[PDB]
Write a protein that binds this ligand. Sequence first.
Ligand code: HEA
Ligand code: HEA
Ligand SMILES: CCCCC/C=C/C/C=C/C/C=C/C/C=C\CCCC(=O)O[C@H](COC(=O)CCCCCCCCCCCCCCCCC)COP(=O)(O)OCCN
Ligand SMILES: CCCCCC/C=C\CCCCCCCCCC(=O)O[C@H](COC(=O)CCCCCCCCCCCCCCC)COP(=O)(O)OC[C@@H](O)CO
Ligand SMILES: CCCCCCCCCCO[C@@H]1O[C@H](CO)[C@@H](O[C@H]2O[C@H](CO)[C@@H](O)[C@H](O)[C@H]2O)[C@H](O)[C@H]1O
Ligand SMILES: CCCCCCCCCCO[C@@H]1O[C@H](CO)[C@@H](O[C@H]2O[C@H](CO)[C@@H](O)[C@H](O)[C@H]2O)[C@H](O)[C@H]1O
Ligand SMILES: CCCCCCCCCCO[C@@H]1O[C@H](CO)[C@@H](O[C@H]2O[C@H](CO)[C@@H](O)[C@H](O)[C@H]2O)[C@H](O)[C@H]1O
Ligand SMILES: C[C@H](CCC(=O)O)[C@H]1CC[C@H]2[C@@H]3[C@H](O)C[C@@H]4C[C@H](O)CC[C@]4(C)[C@H]3C[C@H](O)[C@]12C
Ligand SMILES: C[C@H](CCC(=O)O)[C@H]1CC[C@H]2[C@@H]3[C@H](O)C[C@@H]4C[C@H](O)CC[C@]4(C)[C@H]3C[C@H](O)[C@]12C
Ligand code: CUA
Ligand SMILES: [Ca+2]
Ligand SMILES: [Cu+2]
Ligand SMILES: [Mg+2]
Ligand SMILES: [Zn+2]
Lengths: 44, 143, 227, 70, 72, 56, 513, 40, 44, 102, 49
Amino acid sequence: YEEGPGKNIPFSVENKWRLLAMMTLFFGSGFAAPFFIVRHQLLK
Amino acid sequence: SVVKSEDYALPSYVDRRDYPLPDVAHVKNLSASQKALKEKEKASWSSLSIDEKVELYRLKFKESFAEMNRSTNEWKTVVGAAMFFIGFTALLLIWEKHYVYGPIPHTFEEEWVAKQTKRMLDMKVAPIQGFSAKWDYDKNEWK
Amino acid sequence: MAYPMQLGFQDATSPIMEELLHFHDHTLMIVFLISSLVLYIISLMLTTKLTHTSTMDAQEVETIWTILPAIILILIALPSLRILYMMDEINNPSLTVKTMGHQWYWSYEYTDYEDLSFDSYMIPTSELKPGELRLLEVDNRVVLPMEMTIRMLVSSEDVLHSWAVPSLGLKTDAIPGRLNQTTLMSSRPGLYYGQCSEICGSNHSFMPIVLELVPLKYFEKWSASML
Amino acid sequence: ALAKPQMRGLLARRLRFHIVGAFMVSLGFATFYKFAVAEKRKKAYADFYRNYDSMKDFEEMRKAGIFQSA
Amino acid sequence: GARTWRFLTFGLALPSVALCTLNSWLHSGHRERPAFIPYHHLRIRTKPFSWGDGNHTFFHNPRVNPLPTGYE
Amino acid sequence: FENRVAEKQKLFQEDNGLPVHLKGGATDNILYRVTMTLCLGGTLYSLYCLGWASFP
Amino acid sequence: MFINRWLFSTNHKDIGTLYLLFGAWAGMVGTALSLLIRAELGQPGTLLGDDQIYNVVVTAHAFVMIFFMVMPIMIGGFGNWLVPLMIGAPDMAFPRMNNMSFWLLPPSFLLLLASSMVEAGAGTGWTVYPPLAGNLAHAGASVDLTIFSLHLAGVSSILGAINFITTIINMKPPAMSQYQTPLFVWSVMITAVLLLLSLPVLAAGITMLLTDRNLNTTFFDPAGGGDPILYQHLFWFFGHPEVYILILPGFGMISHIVTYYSGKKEPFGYMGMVWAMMSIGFLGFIVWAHHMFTVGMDVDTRAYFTSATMIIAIPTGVKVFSWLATLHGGNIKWSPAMMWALGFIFLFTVGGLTGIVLANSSLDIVLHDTYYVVAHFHYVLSMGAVFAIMGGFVHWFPLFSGYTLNDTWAKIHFAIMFVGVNMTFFPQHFLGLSGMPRRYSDYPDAYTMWNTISSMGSFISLTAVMLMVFIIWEAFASKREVLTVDLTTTNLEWLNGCPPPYHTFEEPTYVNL
Amino acid sequence: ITAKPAKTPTSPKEQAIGLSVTFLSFLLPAGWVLYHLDNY
Amino acid sequence: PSITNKRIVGCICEEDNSTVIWFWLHKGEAQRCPSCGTHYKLVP
Amino acid sequence: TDEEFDARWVTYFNKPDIDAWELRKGMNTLVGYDLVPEPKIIDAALRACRRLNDFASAVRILEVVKDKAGPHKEIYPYVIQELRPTLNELGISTPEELGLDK
Amino acid sequence: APDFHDKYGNAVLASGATFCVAVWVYMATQIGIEWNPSPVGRVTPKEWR
Ligand code: HEA
Ligand code: HEA
Ligand SMILES: CCCCC/C=C/C/C=C/C/C=C/C/C=C\CCCC(=O)O[C@H](COC(=O)CCCCCCCCCCCCCCCCC)COP(=O)(O)OCCN
Ligand SMILES: CCCCCC/C=C\CCCCCCCCCC(=O)O[C@H](COC(=O)CCCCCCCCCCCCCCC)COP(=O)(O)OC[C@@H](O)CO
Ligand SMILES: CCCCCCCCCCO[C@@H]1O[C@H](CO)[C@@H](O[C@H]2O[C@H](CO)[C@@H](O)[C@H](O)[C@H]2O)[C@H](O)[C@H]1O
Ligand SMILES: CCCCCCCCCCO[C@@H]1O[C@H](CO)[C@@H](O[C@H]2O[C@H](CO)[C@@H](O)[C@H](O)[C@H]2O)[C@H](O)[C@H]1O
Ligand SMILES: CCCCCCCCCCO[C@@H]1O[C@H](CO)[C@@H](O[C@H]2O[C@H](CO)[C@@H](O)[C@H](O)[C@H]2O)[C@H](O)[C@H]1O
Ligand SMILES: C[C@H](CCC(=O)O)[C@H]1CC[C@H]2[C@@H]3[C@H](O)C[C@@H]4C[C@H](O)CC[C@]4(C)[C@H]3C[C@H](O)[C@]12C
Ligand SMILES: C[C@H](CCC(=O)O)[C@H]1CC[C@H]2[C@@H]3[C@H](O)C[C@@H]4C[C@H](O)CC[C@]4(C)[C@H]3C[C@H](O)[C@]12C
Ligand code: CUA
Ligand SMILES: [Ca+2]
Ligand SMILES: [Cu+2]
Ligand SMILES: [Mg+2]
Ligand SMILES: [Zn+2]
C-alpha cells in the first residue's frame, strides 16, 4: 500500500479542483439531506 | 540549511526561548572560509571581529531571541476576517427574512401590543419587580 | 406570565416560589464568582513571559482544590434541602382538584362535593379577543380560591404531559395510571399561566394552563354555576 | 552601579500577589451582590406584602374586567 | 499492586467513610422519645439480670429505655 | 479418527500470499462470493423497501 | 486494493480515518438539523408545521450529534488513531472486530434517516419516552427504525469498548504500568468501561419498548400493570453515564493540548487527573434520577439524587484547577488548538455550574423541561465536547495527514464559532428562567427577543462550519508537508513521523525497569 | 511545528474560488428548499 | 537490541515517574536520555 | 537553600572536561526554574563555552538570561554589569554589541 | 520581507469592521425584524375591554 502524505486516505488529493468537487458533494450531501427530508415530510 | 522529511527520527534544530541550546547546529556544512572561522574560534575571542562573531552565531543558530520572539500584525487579519464572516452571516439572515419568513402574527401589531400591555397591567403581571412594579398606578404612567 | 426581555424568574405568587427566588440568588452568586475566578485565573496564567516548566508538586494545592469546593457544595445543599423538605411538609388542604392531561388539552375535576368537570383548550390565534395573549389563553380557566392550601392531583388519559405554573413554582408530570400530588397556595388574586411541560405530540406547544385566583365566595358561586 | 534586584521566584511572587487580589475582589463582589440583588429582592417582597390588601387587589382586577368568575 | 490498593484506600474508601461520617454527624440530633406503653412483648423479665438491681439492661440509657413500670 | 492438524498447518502456512479467508482453496472463494452477493443484493433490496415505505 | 484497504481494513489508523470522515459527515447533518430548529424558533408563528415535524428534527438533531458525530470522532477516530501510538502498540487487540465497530455505523445512520422518511417520523425526543413513543401515539415503523438504529450503534460501541479496554490493559510495553500511560489513554479506558456497563441497560430498555410496540408486552403500559416511569429509569441509567462518555475523551484531549501548548513535559497532578476521571466515571452511575425530579419520586430519594449529583463538582474541579496549573509558568504558544482548549476550560466550567444549579431538585421543579436545561447541556456539548474535538482536530491533523493547516484561517474559524455558540446559547438561560418549555415549535410572544438573538447566533455558527470545510480543503489543496514537531519526547504519537507508516511499532519500544 | 512551503500553492484567487464553491454547496440546496416551503 | 539501525527508547527516569521520555536511539555512539542523562547503546 | 542550589550549578558548569551535551543539558534544565540564574552560575557556564570553543552558545546564554527576566527590565543590565570582567577577559560580545537584539 | 499581515492587516481590520457594523445595523433596523422589546417606558397602554 502507498504510504505518506495524500496516500493514507480513501480520496484523491492529486488535483485540488477534483478534490473541491468531491468535498462539496460529500459535506454538501450531508448538510442538504435534512432539508430534503423536511420537504418530503411536508409534501405528504 | 535544507530540512528533509527523511531526517524526522534524527535530532533537529529548533528556535524556542525555553530550549535555548538545541540538539544540533543550524548549519553543519562549512565552506573553506567557515572552516577557517571555526579554527579562529579556538583562539582568543578578543581577536574575532564583530562580523566574525555574528557569522559564528548564525552558523550555530537560525534566529536570535529578539527575532524568534517578535510580535506580528496577524491579529488584524484574524479580527478583520472574523468580522467580515460575521457580516456575511447577516446577509444570510436578510435573505431568510425576505424569502422564508412570512408575516408575523397579528398580536405584534402596535394597537394589539398597547391593549395587551394595559391588560397585563390590569392583571398586575409581575407586580413585585418584573412588569407592573414599573407602572405608577397613581399617576397612570411608567415610573 | 413572562414579559418581553425577561432575564430571570416570573415574580413569585406563592411562598415556596419566593423561597426558590432567594435560593437561586444565593446559587447564582456562587456560579458568577466561580465562573469569574476561572476566567480571571486563565487570563493571569496567559499574561506573563515568566516561565517555570520543571515538575511541580501537586498534593498541598489539591487539598485547597477539594476542601473549598466541598464547603461550597454544602453551602448550596443546606438551603436546597431545607426548601425540598419545606415543600414536602404536611399542610391540610381545604380543596382537592384533579387535572387530567390529554392530546391536546387539560380537563379539571372538582369532586369534593359535586361532579364538576370540564375541558380547557387553548384559544386559537384567529379567535383571540383584543389584548389576549397568543398561545396562552384558554376557553375555561381553572378557577381557585386565593390564600387557601389546595391539593392538585395530576394524571393523564393518554401520553405523558406535565402540568406547570412557573409563578407558583409548580411542575408535576402527568403520567397515565399514576396520580401525582402537589400543593398550590396563591398569596394573590389574578391570572397565572403555564404550559404543557412534557413532549406529547402534534400540539404540545398549544395546551396551556390558566389559573384564575379569586376570593372563596366567588369560587363557591362559580363552582355552583359550572355544574 | 546598578543595585542587585530580586532574581528568584518572580513567577511565584506574581501568582501570590494576584491570587490574594482575586480573593479580595471576590469578597467585594459577594458584598455588592448581597446589596444589589439578594437584599434588594428580600426588601422588594417584604415591602410589597407589608401593607398588601388582597381584597383591594381583587376588586381592582374585577372592576378592570379581567375575570371569568367575577 | 500495593500502589493500586493505596490509591483505592485514599481515593475511594476513606472518602466514602468521610462522606458517611458527614451524613451521620448531620442526623446525630436526639429524637423525641415515644410515649411509654407497657406492652407485654417488651421489657421482658423472666429472671432478674445478674448485675445492678436486676431490672436494668446492661447498656440501659435512662433517656430512651423505660423499665417495665415506665421511664425513670 | 486421526490427528490431521499437521496437514492443515502445512496448507494454511503455504507462502502463496492468500489472505486467511481464501487460503483453504476454491470452496472459500465460492462461500465468500455467496456471502457478499447476499449481503450487497439484500442491502439494495433494503433500499428499495425504504423507497416503497417512504410514500403512502 | 482500494476495497482491501478501505472496506476490509485491519489497521487502527485507516479505521480511525474512516471514523473521522463519518463523524464529519454526521456533523453536517446535525448542523443542518440545528439550523432547521433555529429557523423555526427565529420568528414567532409556525414556519414548518405542528410539533410533529419540528420534534422529528429535534430528535434527529440529538441522535446525530451524539451517536454519529461526537462518539465516532472522539472514540472511533481519535481513539483508534492515538491510543495504539501512545502505548507503542502495533494495532488494536481485535483489529478485525474494530472494522465491524466502524461498518455498523453507516447502517445505524441509514435506519435513523429511514425513521424520518417513513410515516410521520419519530417525534419523540432522543429519550424516546412511552407512551408517546408507543404503538398508539406513534403507530407505524418510525420508532422501530429508531430503536434498531440505537441497537446497531450500541453493538458498535460495546464491541469498541471491549477492544479499547483489552488493548489498553494488555498491549502496553511490559515495563509501562497503568500509571505511565498518557491521560488521553486513561480517558478512553474509563469511557470504554462506562460504555460496557451502560449500553446493555439501554439495549434492555429499548428492547422492552420494541416488544411493547410489536409483541403485546406491557412493560411500560399501565393497562397490563406496566409503568412508563420504568422506561425512564432504564433510559437514564444509561443516559447519565452517556454524557460522561461524551466528555471524558474531551477531558483527555484537553489535558494533552494544554500540556503541549504550555511547553510542558507533563500535565500538573497526573495521579489527581486519573483519580478525577475514575471518580467522575463511578459517580456517573449513581445519579441518573436527576433527570426525573418532576415524575413524583419520594422526598428522601430527591434529597439523595441532589446530593450525589453535586459531589461530581469535586473531582471535576480538580481537573479544571489542574489545567490552570498546567498553563502556570508555561511558554504559551497561542496556537488555534490552544484557543479551543482555553475556550473549553471556561465554557465547560459555565455549563458544569448550571448543571449544579439543576442538581437542586427544588429549583429543578421550575427549570426542568425548560430552555435552562438546553443552555446547560449546549455549554457542555456545543462548547465543551465540540471545542475539545476542534482543538484535537487542528492539533493532530498534521499527524494524521502529513500536511499543515493555515493557522490564521484556523484562528478566524475559532473566533467566528466562539461568537456564534455564545450568541446562540447564552440567551437560552433567560428563556429557561422565564419558563419557555423544551420541544416547542412556537412560543408565547414575550419570548421573541431572546429566540431571535439565539437564531442569529446559530447562523454565525453555520458560517464557522462552512469555513472549516474550506480550511480542510485549503490544507489538502496547498500540500505544506510537516518537517519538525516539538516535544516528541513527551508525545510518542508524533515520533514515527507525519503521517506515520501503515505499520508502526513492528519493532516495539525499549523500556527497561 | 515547521513545514515545507506548499507543493501546490493556493493563491488568494484560488482560495476565493474554494471558499465560494464551499459556501454555495451548503447554501444553494437549503436555500432552494426554504424558498419553496410555501409550495410544499 | 534491534533488528534495524534505530529503535525507540522510553526512559522512566525515576521509579514511579508517570512521564515517560521517548526518543530514537541510533546505531553508533551511546546516546543519553534528554531528561536524566542515562546512557543507551544500540546493539543491532 | 539558595546558596546550595547556586553552588551545585557553579560546580556543574566548572567541570573541566564538561562536554557539549552536558553544557546544553545544564542550560536547557536551568531555564525551567522560577529564577534568573545568579551571575556566578552564568560566569561558570560562559567559561564552559570557552573550554568547548563555542562562542555562539556564550551569546545565546546571555540572551536567555534576558528572556528569563520577563518584564523585570532591571535584571539583565545588572547581570551584564556583574559579568563585564568575565566578558572582557574572554572577549564575549553581548547580543546588543552584536546587533542580535534587533 | 513584509508578510500578508504587514501588507493587508490594516485594510482587513478596517473593511471587516465597517462591513460587519453596516450589514448588522441594516439587518436589525431596515427589514422589519420583530424584536418585541419591553413595553416599559415605550408603550402607552390602551383600553382593551
Ligand atoms: C453533541 C451534542 C449536541 C451538539 C453539538 C448540539 C449543537 C447545537 N444544538 Fe442541540 N441538542 C442536543 C445535542 C447537541 N446539540 C440534544 C441532546 C438536544 C435535546 C433533544 C431533545 O430534546 O430530545 C438538543 C436540542 C437542541 C435545541 C432545543 C430544541 C427544543 O427543545 O425544541 C436547540 C435549540 O436551539 C438546539 C440547537 C443546537 C445548535 C444551534 C447547535 C449548534 O451549536 C451546532 C453548530 C455546529 C457544530 C457545533 C459543528 C458540528 C460538526 C463537527 C464538530 C464536525 C467537525 C468536522 C471534523 C472534526 C472533520 N439543540
Ligand atoms: C457532555 C455532556 C454533559 C456533561 C458533562 C454534563 C454534566 C453535568 N450535568 Fe448535565 N445534561 C446534559 C449533558 C451534560 N451534563 C444533557 C444532554 C442533559 C439533558 C438530557 C435531556 O433531558 O435531553 C443534561 C441534563 C442535566 C440535568 C437534568 C435537568 C433537567 O432535565 O431538569 C441535571 C440535573 O442535575 C444535570 C447536571 C449536571 C451536573 C451536576 C454535571 C456535572 O458533571 C458538572 C460538573 C462541573 C462543574 C461543577 C464545573 C467545574 C468545577 C469547578 C470549577 C469546581 C468548583 C465548582 C463548584 C464548587 C460547584 N444535567
Ligand atoms: C460494642 C461492640 C460489641 C460488644 C460485644 C458485647 C459486649 C459485652 C459482652 C460481651 C460478649 C458478647 C457476646 C454475645 C452474648 C450476649 C449478649 C451480647 C450483646 C450486647 O452487648 O447486648 C447488650 C446486653 O448485654 C447483656 O445483656 C449482657 C452481656 C454480658 C453477659 C454475656 C453472657 C453470655 C455468654 C454466652 C457465652 C456462649 C459462648 C459460645 C461458645 C460456643 C462454643 C461451642 C445490649 O444492651 P441493652 O442495654 O440490652 O440494650 C441497649 C439499650 N440502650
Ligand atoms: C435486533 C437485531 C440486532 C442485532 C444486530 C447484531 C449485530 C451485529 C451482527 C454480528 C455479526 C457477528 C460476526 C462474528 C463476530 C466475531 C467477533 C470476534 O470473535 O472477535 C474476537 C474478539 O472479541 C472477543 O474475543 C470477545 C467478544 C466477542 C463478541 C462477539 C459477537 C457479538 C455480537 C452481538 C453482541 C451484543 C451483546 C448483547 C448484550 C448487550 C476476535 O477478534 P478479531 O479482531 O476478529 O481477531 C483477532 C485475532 O487475533 C484472532 O485470531
Ligand atoms: C471571541 C474570541 C476571539 C478570539 C480572538 C483571536 C485573536 C487572534 C490573535 C492572533 O494575533 C496574533 O497572535 C499571536 C499569537 O496567536 C501573537 O504572537 C505574539 O505574542 C505572543 C505573546 O503571547 C508570543 O508568544 C508570540 O511570539 C508573538 O509573536 C501575534 O503578535 C498576534 O498578532
Ligand atoms: C441476492 C439479492 C437478494 C434477494 C432480494 C429478493 C427481493 C425480491 C423478493 C420478492 O418480493 C416480495 O414480493 C411479495 C409480493 O408478492 C411480497 O409478498 C408479501 O406481500 C404481499 C402483498 O400482496 C402479501 O400477500 C403478503 O404479505 C406477502 O406475500 C413480499 O413481501 C416481498 O418480499
Ligand atoms: C439555513 C441554511 C440556508 C440559509 C440561507 C441560504 C441563503 C440562500 C442562498 C440562495 O439560495 C437560493 O436563493 C434563490 C433566491 O434568492 C433561489 O432562487 C429562487 O428565486 C429566484 C429569483 O426569484 C428564481 O430565479 C429561482 O428560480 C428560484 O428557485 C434559489 O433556488 C436558491 O438556491
Ligand atoms: C493515593 C493516590 C495515588 C498516589 C500515588 O500513588 O502517586 C492519590 C492520587 C490522587 C489523590 C487524591 C486527590 O489529590 C484528591 C484529594 C486531595 C486531598 O488533599 C486528599 C484526598 C484526595 C482524594 C487525594 C487522596 C490521595 O492522595 C490520592 C487518591
Ligand atoms: C470411537 C470414538 C473415538 C474418537 C477418537 O478417539 O477419534 C469415540 C470416543 C468418544 C466417543 C463419544 C463419547 O463416548 C460420548 C458419546 C457416547 C454415545 O453413546 C455415542 C456418541 C458419543 C458422542 C461418542 C461418539 C464416538 O464413539 C466417540 C467420539
Ligand atoms: Cu401535553 Cu406537551
Ligand atoms: Ca416560527
Ligand atoms: Cu444526568
Ligand atoms: Mg420532563
Ligand atoms: Zn531518563
